[PDB]
RNA sequence: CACCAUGUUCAA
RNA sequence: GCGCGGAUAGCUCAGUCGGUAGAGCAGGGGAUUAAAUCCCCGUGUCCUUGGUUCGAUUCCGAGUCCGCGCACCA
RNA sequence: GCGGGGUGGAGCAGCCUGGAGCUCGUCGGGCUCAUAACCCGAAGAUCGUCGGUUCAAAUCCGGCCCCCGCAACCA
RNA sequence: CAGAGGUGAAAUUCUUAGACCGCACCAAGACGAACUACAGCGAAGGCAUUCUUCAAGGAUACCUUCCUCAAUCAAGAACCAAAGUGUGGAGAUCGAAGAUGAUUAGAAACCAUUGUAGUCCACACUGCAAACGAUGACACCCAUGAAUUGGGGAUACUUAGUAUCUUUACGGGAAUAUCCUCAGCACGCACGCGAAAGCUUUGAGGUUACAGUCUCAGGGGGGAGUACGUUCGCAAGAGUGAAACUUAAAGAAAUUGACGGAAUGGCACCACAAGACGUGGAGCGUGCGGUUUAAUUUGACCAACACGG
């Protein structure tokens, strides 16, 4: 334990989850374009 | 088959539960023998005191200090 | 562990007469060059000449390792910390005539020479002797504090370390190039070349100790039987083949 | 949270250098910086007192005049590996600042 | 069983014993002074039916006693010692059976010639097994 | 009270109805063979007692029963008779235990 | 250095 | 059809060759503090027969079954 | 038209006459503050159904009722 | 010559077709141990064998030259760890993905044996770090003691010493000792500051007694560094960057408890160890729960259950 309370999942894994969400959103717009 | 050893001094109760005692013993052999006046450290099960005798039946091993 | 082998042979089943291994062995003597007083150090075994496998072809080229204190059988403890290797060049009956291979300081001695707050300086010198032997010298030196010194370290300036290296390289190349292999080995096992280095390199930098930590022969001339006989002088007789 | 050590646990001031190459821990192989690792140079006897006596009794070369060889290792530990092996322990806040410059 | 050199009775005939003591097994390996010809090699796993006891000091002592028995038949009555640990990129700490093997050689009756530690030391190594977080036990 | 969760009255009733008999026999037992010991003397058995039972170094009612395959009650009765005729001698005696031995010469 | 998960809602 | 192998405890096997049936796992018990580890009992008419080396799991001749590789004119 | 399968509450062996097995589940008692995991025990079978053979049928021979496959081509 | 390896124990794995081990070698690719430090160099990222080479860089020394040429900076430019991308090599070790064996209630997790991309090199991209001193740059003042690295100098008072070791050629030498000095990384620290922890000529000081200069960022917690647009990128992504809606706290540092499969020192058979005698299995007495009943009165669930005498 080096950090304080995250009030959520690990920020690195939330950032990765957001990272994959942006990938799938730009693939859904590509197929409509 | 067995060699008698005389407990020279008690080195303290060994391990958890304190049922094993670390002792220093002197091998009781005739004068001029290879085992004469030689000393080893041994683990003893049971109540032991100074000037107590044990039949070691194997004098090559030495107990790890503790 | 005992009784844990699942696949003994990779082919199956068990194929011997319980032949004894040492019944086929023959005992030999390893003879050092004439600059060591204990000439017949070490004993070895080898198979008898059976068929076309001549025992002298497998004995040649073997490298035998011995302590310098045991070979020179005298002098102080400074040579109890050095080990010398000899390569077998010829088989004279039951004698193994050898030639100098390498010398090295034992691992305990070298590891104990290291102190923290000084500088450790290493020099590798490659020279060729008069008879065509190429050697690598591997000198090591350490700085020391002066008696007056109150400082917390005795590190050296890098230009004094480079000066120490170039002087050591000059003296070693100047000396060992003119001499033959037998004289070169005498200079190394008798510490005469070592003391010349410390005497001339201490004016450059205060040195706790300067020693040659490993000599190895890296290139050898073509075999000369007369040169091997000259290097061994009077070869002591071997009683290994004699009847008992 | 709060800064535990002005050292930050390593022997690297702010403007001394940027990067110190890591070493493999002696025990588990964890890559830790060379100035941060807990380094101990040990000199160990190859045999204990009783075992040395038996071997030196059978040795023509070893005895009172000639000592037996020792083992010289520079051991560098990860912080987790040094605390678990008890070569180093947690200290009171006041006692944390005291340093030893020589082996005691 | 004879099989010795042509030396007088009581003469010292020297071998080299290579004691490789790791934390999983111990080797007691007797060769000549060139290391090329081996007389006997007994390991601690050749004495114990269990696998967790191959590094035990008792197994090393038992292996060192079989070494002396065979070395007496080969004419070897003295030994130079070369102890080593795993070395290389792995641990330099000697295994549990190193001292037990050496002491058993002297006690069983053997002249101990010279002792040297020959564990492989790298002047610079390759990457050690495990990650940069090491073994996470 | 530890009222079990989700335990029914039908669950209760089915539990007691199946709780009769079944689980038992926590010991191995290791039964033995019966001892067929005669309660009265036969002609050949009584002949053995008068001849074979003497010159036994140790004589005890339980020993004689183990030899002649008879009860200890009549084994002790015969031993008391052999003492009345001085064929065996009594070394240790109490209410519960008697020890006999052969006479010298 | 075998394995050792969890604890319904408010309020003392 | 021809040359080889294997048939042995409840399962997987080594036999000594030609005077004497055993190991690991399984089952039961004891040392054990959870396995695991150690100690003891486990328990097989040695594929079916004949020739029986003093006596045959062993040596040999015939049959049965199974794995190999090879031969095929009613 | 051809071939295979219904077995304790679930899934699946045995289907090589004389018998039902394995894992999970259920129940009882332990451990725990308590539940789970873990330990010690127990109970639970029309072997789909209707007949036939046999001294004897999950097991063999037919009918039926379901379930799943493969075929359904050249016009 | 019979195992080796590996582990908490094992197994996957290698092995009489000779593994492991031993000696001297050969090949290739990484890396440069000990020395290695609250040490040095660099704008940062970073940078440890030797020798030979190229251009540099700071500090020091100077009675050299010049004469405001400077500080900080939107825009713009160059560099930037690791991972990642492209094309050629290389491929020893280690090793994302994957495979196998364990552990487990589960455990393509930690552990074990392997193993692809990677890891290494050249050229070209990328520009996302706890890229940290979580501390912008320049300038001034600022108390103390012991040190350390590089270059020099000496041996309200009119002036205040001192040695040691080596010494035939990178040598009119090298290192030491004492004193001073400029520059650098710092340690234990008098004001002062600060919510505190702590900082302190190395400020987080000289600030309600608020003004040396320039620049970047922030405005309760989320939504969210998300959406849209746009620029750049081979891609991965990078830069810029909201709103609707939601919420009473989210945070910071210290204090006292409590807890820890964190450490230390003690203690207790309501703990264990060495044991004894039992209880758990049987019958029965009794209490408790359930079932039953018109009612089977009720409390209590280690510290309830021969307890409420
Ligand atoms: K602090
Ligand atoms: K710097
Ligand atoms: K960094
Ligand atoms: K790994
Ligand atoms: K849950
Ligand atoms: K080989
Ligand atoms: K690997
Ligand atoms: K973006
Ligand atoms: K806090
Ligand atoms: K109490
Ligand atoms: K009641
Ligand atoms: Mg913490
Ligand atoms: Mg913290
Ligand atoms: Mg924060
Ligand atoms: Mg210095
Ligand atoms: Mg841990
Ligand atoms: Mg764990
Ligand atoms: Mg092993
Ligand atoms: Mg180096
Ligand atoms: Mg800009
Ligand atoms: Mg890279
Ligand atoms: Mg690439
Ligand atoms: Mg792995
Ligand atoms: Mg950033
Ligand atoms: Mg910041
Ligand atoms: Mg202001
Ligand atoms: Mg805001
Ligand atoms: Mg109790
Ligand atoms: Mg009872
Ligand atoms: Mg009961
Ligand atoms: Mg209490
Ligand atoms: Mg009561
Ligand atoms: Na540290
Ligand atoms: Na409420
Ligand atoms: Na679990
Ligand atoms: Na930092
Ligand atoms: Na410097
Ligand atoms: Na965008
Ligand atoms: Na607290
Ligand atoms: Na007890
Ligand atoms: Na009882």
Short mmCIF file of N, CA, C and O in Angstrom, two decimals, chain C residues 15-81:
data_model
loop_
_atom_site.label_atom_id
_atom_site.label_comp_id
_atom_site.label_asym_id
_atom_site.label_seq_id
_atom_site.Cartn_x
_atom_site.Cartn_y
_atom_site.Cartn_z
N UNK C 15 20.29 -55.07 -21.05
CA UNK C 15 21.24 -55.88 -21.79
C UNK C 15 22.03 -56.85 -20.93
O UNK C 15 23.24 -56.71 -20.78
N UNK C 16 26.58 -58.32 -18.62
CA UNK C 16 27.73 -57.46 -18.88
C UNK C 16 29.00 -58.02 -18.25
O UNK C 16 30.11 -57.59 -18.56
N UNK C 17 28.83 -58.98 -17.35
CA UNK C 17 29.94 -59.62 -16.68
C UNK C 17 30.48 -58.88 -15.47
O UNK C 17 31.41 -59.39 -14.83
N UNK C 18 29.93 -57.71 -15.14
CA UNK C 18 30.35 -56.93 -13.98
C UNK C 18 31.85 -56.65 -14.02
O UNK C 18 32.58 -56.88 -13.05
N UNK C 19 32.32 -56.14 -15.16
CA UNK C 19 33.73 -55.84 -15.33
C UNK C 19 34.16 -54.70 -14.42
O UNK C 19 33.46 -53.70 -14.27
N UNK C 20 35.33 -54.86 -13.79
CA UNK C 20 35.89 -53.82 -12.94
C UNK C 20 36.55 -52.75 -13.80
O UNK C 20 37.25 -53.05 -14.77
N UNK C 21 36.31 -51.49 -13.44
CA UNK C 21 36.79 -50.38 -14.26
C UNK C 21 38.30 -50.19 -14.11
O UNK C 21 39.00 -49.96 -15.10
N UNK C 22 38.81 -50.31 -12.89
CA UNK C 22 40.22 -50.03 -12.65
C UNK C 22 41.14 -51.15 -13.11
O UNK C 22 42.36 -50.98 -13.06
N UNK C 23 40.59 -52.28 -13.55
CA UNK C 23 41.42 -53.35 -14.09
C UNK C 23 42.07 -52.95 -15.40
O UNK C 23 43.14 -53.48 -15.75
N UNK C 24 41.45 -52.04 -16.15
CA UNK C 24 41.98 -51.58 -17.43
C UNK C 24 42.81 -50.30 -17.31
O UNK C 24 43.35 -49.84 -18.32
N UNK C 25 42.95 -49.74 -16.11
CA UNK C 25 43.68 -48.50 -15.95
C UNK C 25 45.17 -48.75 -15.76
O UNK C 25 45.58 -49.77 -15.20
N UNK C 26 45.97 -47.81 -16.24
CA UNK C 26 47.42 -47.82 -16.07
C UNK C 26 47.85 -46.52 -15.42
O UNK C 26 47.34 -45.45 -15.77
N UNK C 27 48.79 -46.60 -14.49
CA UNK C 27 49.20 -45.45 -13.70
C UNK C 27 50.38 -44.75 -14.35
O UNK C 27 51.29 -45.39 -14.88
N UNK C 28 50.36 -43.42 -14.30
CA UNK C 28 51.37 -42.58 -14.94
C UNK C 28 51.88 -41.54 -13.95
O UNK C 28 51.26 -41.28 -12.92
N UNK C 29 53.02 -40.96 -14.29
CA UNK C 29 53.62 -39.88 -13.52
C UNK C 29 53.60 -38.60 -14.33
O UNK C 29 53.91 -38.61 -15.53
N UNK C 30 53.24 -37.50 -13.69
CA UNK C 30 53.23 -36.18 -14.33
C UNK C 30 54.51 -35.46 -13.91
O UNK C 30 54.73 -35.23 -12.72
N UNK C 31 55.34 -35.12 -14.88
CA UNK C 31 56.64 -34.51 -14.63
C UNK C 31 56.58 -33.04 -15.04
O UNK C 31 56.22 -32.73 -16.18
N UNK C 32 56.91 -32.16 -14.11
CA UNK C 32 56.96 -30.73 -14.35
C UNK C 32 58.31 -30.34 -14.94
O UNK C 32 59.29 -31.08 -14.83
N UNK C 33 58.38 -29.19 -15.61
CA UNK C 33 59.67 -28.72 -16.14
C UNK C 33 60.71 -28.56 -15.04
O UNK C 33 60.42 -28.61 -13.85
N UNK C 34 61.95 -28.35 -15.47
CA UNK C 34 63.09 -28.42 -14.57
C UNK C 34 63.23 -27.21 -13.65
O UNK C 34 64.09 -27.24 -12.76
N UNK C 35 62.43 -26.16 -13.83
CA UNK C 35 62.50 -25.02 -12.93
C UNK C 35 61.68 -25.20 -11.66
O UNK C 35 61.69 -24.31 -10.80
N UNK C 36 60.98 -26.33 -11.52
CA UNK C 36 60.29 -26.69 -10.29
C UNK C 36 61.03 -27.86 -9.65
O UNK C 36 61.41 -28.81 -10.35
N UNK C 37 61.24 -27.79 -8.34
CA UNK C 37 62.05 -28.83 -7.69
C UNK C 37 61.27 -30.12 -7.47
O UNK C 37 61.87 -31.20 -7.50
N UNK C 38 59.96 -30.05 -7.25
CA UNK C 38 59.14 -31.27 -7.19
C UNK C 38 58.74 -31.61 -8.61
O UNK C 38 57.70 -31.18 -9.11
N UNK C 39 59.59 -32.39 -9.28
CA UNK C 39 59.36 -32.70 -10.69
C UNK C 39 58.19 -33.65 -10.87
O UNK C 39 57.30 -33.40 -11.70
N UNK C 40 58.15 -34.73 -10.11
CA UNK C 40 57.13 -35.77 -10.29
C UNK C 40 55.98 -35.53 -9.32
O UNK C 40 55.75 -36.28 -8.37
N UNK C 41 55.24 -34.46 -9.58
CA UNK C 41 53.99 -34.20 -8.90
C UNK C 41 52.86 -34.97 -9.58
O UNK C 41 52.92 -35.27 -10.77
N UNK C 42 51.84 -35.32 -8.79
CA UNK C 42 50.61 -35.91 -9.29
C UNK C 42 50.78 -37.30 -9.89
O UNK C 42 51.86 -37.67 -10.37
N UNK C 43 49.70 -38.09 -9.85
CA UNK C 43 49.61 -39.38 -10.52
C UNK C 43 48.27 -39.45 -11.22
O UNK C 43 47.30 -38.83 -10.78
N UNK C 44 48.21 -40.20 -12.32
CA UNK C 44 46.98 -40.29 -13.10
C UNK C 44 46.81 -41.71 -13.62
O UNK C 44 47.75 -42.51 -13.62
N UNK C 45 45.59 -42.02 -14.05
CA UNK C 45 45.27 -43.29 -14.67
C UNK C 45 44.93 -43.05 -16.13
O UNK C 45 44.62 -41.93 -16.54
N UNK C 46 45.00 -44.12 -16.92
CA UNK C 46 44.56 -44.08 -18.31
C UNK C 46 44.31 -45.51 -18.77
O UNK C 46 44.85 -46.46 -18.21
N UNK C 47 43.48 -45.64 -19.80
CA UNK C 47 43.20 -46.95 -20.36
C UNK C 47 44.46 -47.52 -21.02
O UNK C 47 45.34 -46.79 -21.46
N UNK C 48 44.53 -48.85 -21.07
CA UNK C 48 45.60 -49.48 -21.83
C UNK C 48 45.36 -49.27 -23.32
O UNK C 48 44.24 -49.04 -23.78
N UNK C 49 46.45 -49.34 -24.09
CA UNK C 49 46.34 -49.28 -25.54
C UNK C 49 45.57 -50.50 -26.02
O UNK C 49 46.05 -51.63 -25.93
N UNK C 50 44.36 -50.28 -26.52
CA UNK C 50 43.46 -51.35 -26.95
C UNK C 50 43.06 -51.09 -28.39
O UNK C 50 42.44 -50.06 -28.69
N UNK C 51 43.39 -52.03 -29.27
CA UNK C 51 43.08 -51.84 -30.68
C UNK C 51 43.89 -50.70 -31.27
O UNK C 51 45.11 -50.62 -31.11
N UNK C 52 43.19 -49.81 -31.97
CA UNK C 52 43.83 -48.64 -32.56
C UNK C 52 43.82 -47.43 -31.64
O UNK C 52 44.37 -46.39 -32.00
N UNK C 53 43.20 -47.54 -30.46
CA UNK C 53 43.17 -46.44 -29.50
C UNK C 53 44.43 -46.51 -28.65
O UNK C 53 44.47 -47.21 -27.63
N UNK C 54 45.46 -45.79 -29.06
CA UNK C 54 46.73 -45.74 -28.34
C UNK C 54 46.57 -44.77 -27.18
O UNK C 54 46.05 -43.66 -27.34
N UNK C 55 47.03 -45.19 -25.99
CA UNK C 55 46.86 -44.38 -24.79
C UNK C 55 47.63 -43.07 -24.84
O UNK C 55 47.26 -42.12 -24.14
N UNK C 56 48.70 -42.99 -25.64
CA UNK C 56 49.49 -41.77 -25.69
C UNK C 56 48.77 -40.66 -26.46
O UNK C 56 49.06 -39.48 -26.24
N UNK C 57 47.85 -41.01 -27.35
CA UNK C 57 47.13 -39.99 -28.10
C UNK C 57 46.08 -39.29 -27.26
O UNK C 57 45.76 -38.12 -27.52
N UNK C 58 45.53 -39.97 -26.25
CA UNK C 58 44.55 -39.33 -25.38
C UNK C 58 45.20 -38.68 -24.16
O UNK C 58 44.59 -37.79 -23.55
N UNK C 59 46.41 -39.10 -23.79
CA UNK C 59 47.10 -38.48 -22.67
C UNK C 59 47.69 -37.12 -23.03
O UNK C 59 47.78 -36.24 -22.17
N UNK C 60 48.11 -36.94 -24.28
CA UNK C 60 48.69 -35.68 -24.70
C UNK C 60 47.64 -34.58 -24.71
O UNK C 60 46.50 -34.80 -25.12
N UNK C 61 48.04 -33.39 -24.27
CA UNK C 61 47.14 -32.26 -24.20
C UNK C 61 46.40 -32.12 -22.89
O UNK C 61 45.68 -31.13 -22.71
N UNK C 62 46.55 -33.06 -21.96
CA UNK C 62 45.89 -32.95 -20.67
C UNK C 62 46.58 -31.90 -19.82
O UNK C 62 47.81 -31.79 -19.80
N UNK C 63 45.77 -31.12 -19.10
CA UNK C 63 46.25 -30.00 -18.30
C UNK C 63 46.14 -30.38 -16.83
O UNK C 63 45.05 -30.71 -16.35
N UNK C 64 47.26 -30.33 -16.12
CA UNK C 64 47.33 -30.73 -14.72
C UNK C 64 47.54 -29.51 -13.84
O UNK C 64 48.43 -28.70 -14.10
N UNK C 65 46.72 -29.41 -12.80
CA UNK C 65 46.70 -28.26 -11.91
C UNK C 65 47.32 -28.63 -10.57
O UNK C 65 46.95 -29.63 -9.96
N UNK C 66 48.27 -27.81 -10.12
CA UNK C 66 48.97 -28.05 -8.86
C UNK C 66 49.27 -26.73 -8.18
O UNK C 66 49.41 -25.69 -8.83
N UNK C 67 49.36 -26.78 -6.85
CA UNK C 67 49.71 -25.60 -6.08
C UNK C 67 51.20 -25.29 -6.23
O UNK C 67 52.03 -26.20 -6.33
N UNK C 68 51.53 -24.00 -6.25
CA UNK C 68 52.93 -23.61 -6.41
C UNK C 68 53.75 -23.93 -5.17
O UNK C 68 54.95 -24.21 -5.28
N UNK C 69 53.14 -23.89 -3.98
CA UNK C 69 53.87 -24.24 -2.77
C UNK C 69 54.26 -25.71 -2.76
O UNK C 69 55.32 -26.08 -2.26
N UNK C 70 53.40 -26.57 -3.30
CA UNK C 70 53.72 -27.99 -3.38
C UNK C 70 54.79 -28.26 -4.43
O UNK C 70 55.63 -29.15 -4.25
N UNK C 71 54.78 -27.51 -5.53
CA UNK C 71 55.78 -27.71 -6.58
C UNK C 71 57.15 -27.21 -6.15
O UNK C 71 58.16 -27.89 -6.33
N UNK C 72 57.21 -26.01 -5.57
CA UNK C 72 58.48 -25.45 -5.13
C UNK C 72 58.88 -25.90 -3.73
O UNK C 72 60.00 -25.63 -3.31
N UNK C 73 57.98 -26.57 -3.01
CA UNK C 73 58.29 -27.29 -1.77
C UNK C 73 59.06 -26.44 -0.76
O UNK C 73 59.77 -26.98 0.10
N UNK C 74 58.93 -25.12 -0.82
CA UNK C 74 59.69 -24.24 0.07
C UNK C 74 59.04 -22.86 0.06
O UNK C 74 57.91 -22.68 -0.41
N UNK C 75 59.76 -21.88 0.63
CA UNK C 75 59.38 -20.47 0.63
C UNK C 75 58.10 -20.22 1.41
O UNK C 75 57.51 -21.14 1.98
N UNK C 76 57.65 -18.96 1.42
CA UNK C 76 56.61 -18.52 2.32
C UNK C 76 55.21 -18.82 1.81
O UNK C 76 54.99 -19.58 0.87
N UNK C 77 54.24 -18.18 2.47
CA UNK C 77 52.83 -18.38 2.19
C UNK C 77 52.35 -17.63 0.96
O UNK C 77 51.22 -17.88 0.50
N UNK C 78 53.16 -16.73 0.40
CA UNK C 78 52.74 -15.98 -0.77
C UNK C 78 52.55 -16.86 -1.99
O UNK C 78 51.84 -16.46 -2.93
N UNK C 79 53.16 -18.04 -2.02
CA UNK C 79 52.98 -18.97 -3.13
C UNK C 79 52.03 -20.12 -2.80
O UNK C 79 51.69 -20.89 -3.70
N UNK C 80 51.60 -20.24 -1.55
CA UNK C 80 50.50 -21.15 -1.23
C UNK C 80 49.18 -20.68 -1.81
O UNK C 80 48.21 -21.45 -1.81
N UNK C 81 49.13 -19.45 -2.30
CA UNK C 81 47.93 -18.86 -2.88
C UNK C 81 48.00 -18.78 -4.39
O UNK C 81 47.23 -18.03 -5.00
#
